[PDB]
């Protein structure tokens, strides 16, 4: 089937440059125009640029005009997007989209998976975990809530995991989206444990684990 695969995304500081690739397959790449559409984290879709099948016409969104540059290699069936003078504003998932037919108004019928382009002045780092224990514990509830605070990480690619003291997975986990705390991200996780006597006893604590490209870390959260 028609497959489009972007690549080239990464963590980069402002002023720097990056170059995306979109490998097309399953269709006559050379016969269609291609578009680059970005989507800022938690926001709408924003059109970046387009290039005609014959490479004659190339248009860009006002915000990227002069900084980005679109191109294609009809022989390699690859579309490119050269991103220069990256600003924090450009942080987003970049999708390359094929148009449906030979017409200026043609709809983007096939989209790629996208690449995350995180532009921050902070440096990529693994999160700093801190335990979140309810003040005086959650006694007036059938479930004591302990949490885990992951902070100062970049890029926004973390996965929380919880294991009981006996090293087995915890089902009652809540994962919250990451908030941008000045260049870096911070995220929270929460576990709801049955206070009904089994609030602790033997299990003096639980284990909070986080996955991250720059380093997986864990912490013990007291019960």
């Amino acid at each position: 089937q028609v497959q489009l695969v972007e690549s080239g995304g990464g963590v980069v500081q402002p002023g720097k440059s990056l170059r995306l690739s979109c490998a097309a397959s399953g269709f006559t790449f050379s016969g269609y125009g291609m578009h680059w559409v970005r989507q800022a984290p938690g926001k709408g879709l924003e059109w970046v640029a387009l290039i005609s099948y014959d490479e004659s016409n190339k248009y860009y969104a006002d915000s990227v005009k002069g900084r980005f540059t679109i191109s294609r290699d009809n022989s390699k069936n690859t579309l490119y997007l050269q991103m220069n003078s990256l600003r924090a504003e450009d942080t987003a998932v970049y999708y390359c989209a094929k148009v449906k037919f030979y017409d200026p108004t043609a709809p983007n019928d096939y989209w790629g998976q996208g690449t995350l382009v995180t532009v921050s002045s902070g440096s990529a780092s693994a999160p700093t975990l801190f335990p979140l224990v309810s003040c005086e514990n959650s006694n007036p509830s059938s479930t004591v809530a302990v949490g885990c605070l992951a902070q100062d990480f970049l890029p926004d690619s973390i996965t929380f995991s919880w294991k009981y003291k006996n090293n087995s997975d915890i089902s009652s986990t809540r994962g919250f989206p990451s908030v941008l705390r000045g260049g870096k991200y911070a995220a929270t996780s929460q576990v709801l444990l049955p206070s009904k006597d089994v609030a602790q006893g033997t299990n003096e604590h639980v284990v909070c684990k986080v996955q991250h490209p720059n380093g997986n870390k864990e912490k013990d959260v007291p019960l």
Binding site: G44, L45, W47, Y110, P131, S134, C135, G147, F176, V179
Partner: protein
């Protein structure tokens, strides 16, 4: 630039309901409006182009109409898979513009949030920063207002919210607000209050603690 205005921002509906999303443009785009559907973590899918032409494979329960400046998307009868975010796009002029999106969420019964407050770990305090965390669990609708009151003084600018996606099992949401202060500022305050006001609470519930009582 052709400004696209989409309404409503979000709409609660149940399977079987007829849905109608509207998209309006600041200037005529004469029927060249496209409708895309997007689910969390996935790429947009083309549903309708040229205001009313259905893309190959798109179910017939989807239909569009309109011209010039007012277009609408109608889902004759929502199905479980139709709950997603929908965008309208204008491919009449370059730059191509998109609507802000319309999230079609599952209609659920009102639920009061289980609020919780967590004080910063000593480890974190020793390192210079204080993160007071307030987690609201399983509530509905999404409209919940958390307010930080440090010593009964309104806090603004140092709190950050994060709402989960509508829970797959119960159609509820959860929010986490984080008030971040520097160790020094934290220590010069006793009562840390998280005032939660939600459509399912007769009165604003406040969860708090006095620095050092735990």
């Amino acid at each position: 630039d052709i400004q696209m205005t989409q309404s409503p921002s979000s709409l609660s509906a149940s399977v079987g309901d007829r849905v109608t999303i509207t998209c309006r443009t600041s200037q005529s785009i004469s029927s060249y409006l496209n409708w895309y559907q997007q689910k969390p973590g996935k790429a947009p899918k083309l549903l309708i182009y040229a205001a009313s032409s259905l893309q190959s494979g798109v179910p017939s329960r989807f239909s569009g109409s309109g011209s010039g400046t007012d277009f609408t998307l109608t889902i004759s009868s929502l199905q479980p898979e139709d709950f997603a975010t929908y965008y309208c796009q204008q491919s009449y002029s370059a730059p191509r513009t998109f609507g802000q999106g319309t999230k079609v969420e599952i209609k659920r019964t009102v639920a009061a949030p289980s609020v919780f407050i967590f004080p910063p770990s000593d480890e974190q305090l020793k390192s210079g920063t204080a993160s007071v965390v307030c987690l609201l669990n399983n509530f509905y609708p999404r409209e919940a207002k958390v307010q930080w009151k440090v010593d009964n003084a309104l806090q603004s600018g140092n709190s950050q919210e994060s709402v989960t996606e509508q829970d797959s099992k119960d159609s509820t949401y959860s929010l986490s607000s984080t008030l971040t202060l520097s160790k020094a500022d934290y220590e010069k305050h006793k009562v840390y209050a998280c005032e939660v006001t939600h459509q399912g609470l007769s009165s604003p519930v406040t969860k708090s603690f006095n620095r050092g009582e735990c």
